[PDB]
Design a protein around this ligand. Structure first.
Ligand code: CL
Ligand code: NA
Length: 129
């Protein structure tokens, strides 16, 4: 599923991400835009052999099991394929665990390099919640 901007902002707000660990909704929408272009089906291989999955590009090195990342963890206790669903519940619940692990949204390279210290409120401008 390719979300619209405000459709994704509403889905993230309904799943409890607005000001989750102090990160405003626009931070989450900006992260999703630059990680996946709002596409739940996005996958990308990392240099180490792990793979990133879904709208927030969650990595199999630590967070999910994809059956092909040897010596990795599954800290979200999910198959990586759950992160590709049109339903973002699994991605949101795993993102809450990641953002709580010590580095906050710095876990998302795209967020640090493209969203952090920008006017992220722009990403929810015009949206009905
Ligand atoms: Cl933080
Ligand atoms: Na894994």
């Amino acid at each position: 599923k390719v979300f619209g901007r405000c459709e994704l902002a509403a889905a993230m707000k309904r799943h409890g991400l607005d000001n989750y660990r102090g990160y405003s909704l626009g931070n989450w929408v900006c992260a999703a835009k630059f990680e996946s272009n709002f596409n739940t089906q996005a996958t990308n291989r990392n240099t180490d052999g792990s793979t990133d999955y879904g709208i927030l590009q969650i990595n199999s090195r630590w967070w999910c099991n994809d059956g092909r990342t040897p010596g990795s963890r599954n800290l979200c206790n999910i198959p990586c394929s759950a992160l590709l669903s049109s339903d973002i519940t699994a991605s949101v619940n795993c993102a809450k665990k990641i953002v709580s692990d010590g580095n906050g949204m710095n876990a998302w390279v795209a967020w640090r390099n493209r969203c952090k210290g920008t006017d992220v409120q722009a990403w929810i401008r015009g949206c009905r919640l």
